[PDB]
């Protein structure tokens, strides 16, 4: 597909809508939207492997990592495909989101459609924390709100 | 295996459930699920073409119909790919069901939506202007994206 959407929902006040769009085959994917209810600062923003949320974070799994690499930031070469870095919530809790990534895709082996998009509790340290947890989740913390990436018109 | 999926159904009401998909063969797909909070009776179950939950279940679009067919029941060959017929909820409001489909294929519905309606799907036989379009099943009750 060329467009996708995701509605982030959670048990807390965190909630928002994220849009996806890709105009070139295996090209860049524009990721833009809005989230509210967050604490001011940077928050992890990842695509996990599975959209199955029957068990929540357990069934959603780790970061979408088809190439079997270690965690990183979106600008790094050693990264998970689902590694999209941080988003910024202002002093009112609103996170105006705008990302452009070419490792993710709306087609092919790196397709993220049907998977889980999660905004996390803490800020992603981009895999530079010194501990092993940095090489897995970037110490981003627990899931604040999540949603499935579905095909949009 | 040629694909598996799962859809958690939710809406602005008491209806909620979990439906799973498994592509047994290239030409046969297994569909099983359990949905609670339904009024006792028949309820239409359909795959819509957009997994867009930004407006309850209304932004999900029409029945997934890539071949440009008319609405029908599961036993009709001329039917939308997303036409799954009715499921029945018992007196307690629970609808447990298990079906195979020979047109709906898991890889082609990943990212799309699965919706259950308030009324019965007339399978295109109701003699109504909506029969050949939706099945005249009324309002949408709960929906969810078919997830990997
Ligand atoms: Zn990662
Ligand atoms: Zn139909």
Author numbering:
A (entry chain B): 1 to 153
B (entry chain A): 85 to 232
From the paper:
Superoxide dismutase-1 (SOD1) is one of the most abundant human proteins and is an important part of our antioxidant, redox signalling and respiratory control mechanisms. Here, we discover the mechanisms that govern SOD1 maturation and stabilisation through interaction with the chaperone protein hCCS. Combinations of mutants yielded crystallographic structures of full-length hCCS in two different conformers complexed with hSOD1; an hCCS domain II truncation complexed with hSOD1; an hCCS domain II homodimer structure at higher resolution than previously available (1.55 Å); and the hSOD1 disulphide knock-out mutant used to promote complexation.
In contrast, hSOD1 must be in the disulphide-reduced state to complex with hCCS. Without the Cys57-Cys146 covalent tether, the hSOD1 disulphide sub-loop can adapt to the presence of hCCS Ala231, mitigating repulsive effects. In this way, hCCS provides a surface of repulsive and attractive noncovalent interactions that mould the plastic hSOD1 disulphide sub-loop into a stable but novel conformation. This provides a mechanism for the molecular chaperone activity of hCCS. The SOD1 disulphide sub-loop Gly51-Asp52-Asn53-Thr54 (GDNT) tetrad motif forms many of the interactions across the hSOD1-hCCS heterodimer interface. We suggest this primes hSOD1 for reception of copper and the disulphide, before any interaction with hCCS domain I or III takes place.
